[PDB]
Amino acid sequence: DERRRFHRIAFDADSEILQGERRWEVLLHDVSLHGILVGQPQDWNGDPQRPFEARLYLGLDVLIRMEISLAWARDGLLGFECQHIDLDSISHLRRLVELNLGDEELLERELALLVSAHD
Amino acid sequence: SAANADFELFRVFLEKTCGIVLGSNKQYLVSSRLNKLMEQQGIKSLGELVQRIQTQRGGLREMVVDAMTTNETLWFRDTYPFEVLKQRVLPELIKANGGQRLRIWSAACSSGQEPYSLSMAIDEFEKTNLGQLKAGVQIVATDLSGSMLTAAKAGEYDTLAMGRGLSPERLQRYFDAKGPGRWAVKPAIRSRVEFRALNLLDSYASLGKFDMVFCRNVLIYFSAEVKRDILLRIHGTLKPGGYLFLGASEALNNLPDHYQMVQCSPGIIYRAK
Ligand SMILES: Nc1nc2c(ncn2[C@@H]2O[C@@H]3COP(=O)(O)O[C@H]4[C@@H](O)[C@H](n5cnc6c(=O)[nH]c(N)nc65)O[C@@H]4COP(=O)(O)O[C@H]3[C@H]2O)c(=O)[nH]1
Ligand SMILES: Nc1nc2c(ncn2[C@@H]2O[C@@H]3COP(=O)(O)O[C@H]4[C@@H](O)[C@H](n5cnc6c(=O)[nH]c(N)nc65)O[C@@H]4COP(=O)(O)O[C@H]3[C@H]2O)c(=O)[nH]1
Numbered sequence: 516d517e518r519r520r521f522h523r524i525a526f527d528a529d530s531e532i533l534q535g536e537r538r539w540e541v542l543l544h545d546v547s548l549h550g551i552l553v554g555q556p557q558d559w560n561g562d563p564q565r566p567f568e569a570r571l572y573l574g575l576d577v578l579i580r581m582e583i584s585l586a587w588a589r590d591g592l593l594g595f596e597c598q599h600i601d602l603d604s605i606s607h608l609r610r611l612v613e614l615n616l617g618d619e620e621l622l623e624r625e626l627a628l629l630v631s632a633h634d
Numbered sequence: 635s636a637a638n639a640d641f642e643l644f645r646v647f648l649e650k651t652c653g654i655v656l657g658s659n660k661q662y663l664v665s666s667r668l669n670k671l672m673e674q675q676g677i678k679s680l681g682e683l684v685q686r687i688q689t690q691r692g693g694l695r696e697m698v699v700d701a702m703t704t705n706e707t708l709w710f711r712d713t714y715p716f717e718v719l720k721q722r723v724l725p726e727l728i729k730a731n732g733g734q735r736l737r738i739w740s741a742a743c744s745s746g747q748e749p750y751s752l753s754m755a756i757d758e759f760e761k762t763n764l765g766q767l768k769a770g771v772q773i774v775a776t777d778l779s780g781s782m783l784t785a786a787k788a789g790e791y792d793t794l795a796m797g798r799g800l801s802p803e804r805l806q807r808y809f810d811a812k813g814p815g816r817w818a819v820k821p822a823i824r825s826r827v828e829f830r831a832l833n834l835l836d837s838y839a840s841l842g843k844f845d846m847v848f849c850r851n852v853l854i855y856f857s858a859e860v861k862r863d864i865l866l867r868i869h870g871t872l873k874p875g876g877y878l879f880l881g882a883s884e885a886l887n888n889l890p891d892h893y894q895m896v897q898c899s900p901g902i903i904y905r906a907k
Contacts, residue, residue, distance in 0.1 A: 527857050574854035575883040582653075599653045602660065602702070609703040611855040614742070617833040619779050627696040629652055 520628040521547040524615045526571075532583075532593075533568040534561060543571065544592070548612045548625050549632070551583070555591045563588070569595060573611075579604045640681035647684055652699060664702070666794045670785070671701045704782055707747040709799035711850065712882045714900040716755040719846075722898055723877060724759050727845050728766050730875065735769035739844040739871065742834060742852040743775035746786025746827075747795070752848065753823045754808050771826060774841060779831040787829045789819040834864050838871045845873055850881030865889060872906035879903055 523545040530543040530553060537560060541553035551569055561567070563585040571579040581604055583595035600608070613622050641661050648654040656664070668683065675694070677683045687695050710716050727736055740749040756771045777783045793815040796805065809817040832841070834852070847868055853861050868878065869892045878893065880886065886893055886904055893904040 525857055528854075574851075576851065577854050597653065599649070599655050601655050602657060602663075605652075605654055606703045606705045607855075610705060613778060613780075614834060614852070614855045615860075617778065617835045622780075623696060623700070626699050627693070630695040630699055633651055 520632075521549045521625050522612070522616060522621070523547045523550075523552065524612065526611075529572045531570045531572075532556070532561070533570065534565065537561075541593070546571065546608075546611070548597075548608060548629060550586070550594065550596045553593050553595070555588065555593050561585065561593075566598065567595065573607070577607050579607050579611075581605075581608075637680070640679060640684065643684045644680055647687065648702070651695065654699075654702070662794060666792055667701050667704065668698065669792065670781075671697055700781060705744075706795065707744045709747050709795075710751045710755075711748070711799070715850075715879055715882075716751060718898045718901050718903070719752070719755055720759045723846065723903070724756075724766075727875075728763075733766055733768035736767065736771045736845045737843065738771060738773045739841060739847045739849075740773060740775040740827075741847065741849040741868075743777050743783075743786055743829070745782050745791075745795075746775065746789065746829075747799075748848060748850070749773050749775035749786070749827045749829075750789065750819055750823060753819075753826050754804060756826065757808070757822065773827040774844075775827055775829050776832040776841070778833050783829060783831060789824050791817055835860070838867055841871055843873050844871050845876045846879070847872055847876070848879045850879055851884070853880070853884065862888060866892065869893070869906055874906055876906045877903045878906065 524547060525544070526546040527543050530541050530551075532539045532541050532553065539556040539558065541556055544552040544554065546552075551571075567583045567585060569581050569583045573579065580601060581597050582599040584598055585593060586596045587594040609626075612625065616622055616625075641664065644664065645656045648656050664680070668680070672678070672683060675686070677686060683698070687698060724736075738752055740752060743749045752773055756773070760767060775786065777786070790812060796809075796817055805817070808820050808823045810820055812818045830841070832838075849868060853864065856864065865886070865888065869889070872878065877896075880902075885902075886895065892907060894907055896903050896905055
């Protein structure tokens with residue numbers, strides 16, 4: 516029934532998509548422990564075959580940076596899956612998910628699925 | 635020689651399993667964050683942890699990721715807010731209620747550095763103002779049930795957590811050595827702080843009323859709408875005239891009829907209207 520391993524949280528922080536030398540400001544729709552949803556920008560030259568980088572600017576202090584790959588595009592939206600993420604960024608992301616899930620069992624279960632993603 | 639190679643296998647494990655990129659000069663951070671887990675699991679080395687992870691599994695990989703992605707909190711973060719507390723806010727609130735019981739809320743207290751920083755500040759204010767706080771000051775600290783909240787309750791910290799933001803004066807006055815590289819807050823600092831498992835998205839009704847609320851560097855983790863709800867409901871716990879603290883680079887930029895921004899020379903606080 517539910518094919519989604521990670522709960523997707525409505526979130527609207529200032530966001531950027533990067534690829535090589537190109538950048539687009541995108542409108543963030545949701546975020547999860549393992550991906551994001553954003554609005555397709557107007558000048559979308561994006562190459563789905565190569566990796567992207569996302570930057571979520573939560574506040575002056577906190578930046579969530581991750582390597583992303585385009586998982587799908589439909590109806591003016593772009594779904595991204597998280598690949599590589601630095602320790603600092605995944606720590607802020609885990610805190611965001613934690614605070615918004617509000618349930619330790621739900622968190623534990625999501626972290627378990629994160630680790631077993633490549634089993 | 636041998637310890638460095640283990641750290642390199644751990645680095646690889648993080649990258650190949652979770653896509654987590656460690657980076658270098660994080661050996662000391664790694665050891666600190668994994669320390670309690672390793673003690674509980676009887677694991678005596680990073681190399682032993684790595685082999686134990688890929689073979690036994692059974693929830694151990696999840697525990698390492700849980701501990702590894704738990705961010706540290708700083709002692710007396712930004713410094714000026716605790717000085718504003720002692721030399722401006724406490725004197726005002728005290729002078730306003732006759733020395734009645736003051737209550738302070740430390741929201742999302744994490745590993746506990748903030749609530750304990752507030753406790754130490756209160757103690758420092760009291761030593762110079764005997765008799766002002768007739769009923770004393772109660773500190774209520776909240777966060778999600780979990781590893782951080784458990785560590786905070788215990789009040790023990792390691793070398794890394796103590797080697798930043800904490801003066802030599804404060805180390806002696808408020809901490810007790812508990813074996814090599816481990817310190818614990820004295821009873822005097824501990825007993826004025828009460829920890830409660832409660833998330834910012836939960837109701838605040840059970841918390842009662844506060845003269846001061848500390849909600850610093852945490853509202854950034856919520857959407858605009860959810861943040862506004864938290865700020866509104868926080869207002870409901872504040873006594874009129876009470877103050878909200880947000881953190882050095884956060885502005886409220888909202889709710890002008892609930893909160894009045896106030897300049898404190900160094901800093902900004904919000905008075906509940
Ligand atoms: N490859 C891929 N594509 C995605 C993903 N998420 C969304 N899409 C695409 O975006 C459309 C909108 O998804 P939705 O707005 O959440 O609207 C969805 C959603 O509300 C719901 N839904 C469908 N499948 C699932 C599911 O597996 N789990 C959950 N929780 N809801 C689902 O049905 C609606 C329509 O489903 P779709 O026709 O599939 O249409 C989906 C799909 O084409 C994804 O993770 N991977
Ligand atoms: N926050 C956020 N994260 C996103 C989004 N799109 C993809 N991700 C992340 O990328 C992963 C890969 O999804 P997929 O390859 O399309 O593979 C997906 C897809 O095949 C399928 N699926 C899940 N939801 C839908 C849906 O709504 N519609 C359709 N047609 N397929 C879905 O389940 C598989 C695994 O789903 P996930 O575990 O959730 O894992 C997703 C998710 O972690 C998004 O729009 N927002």
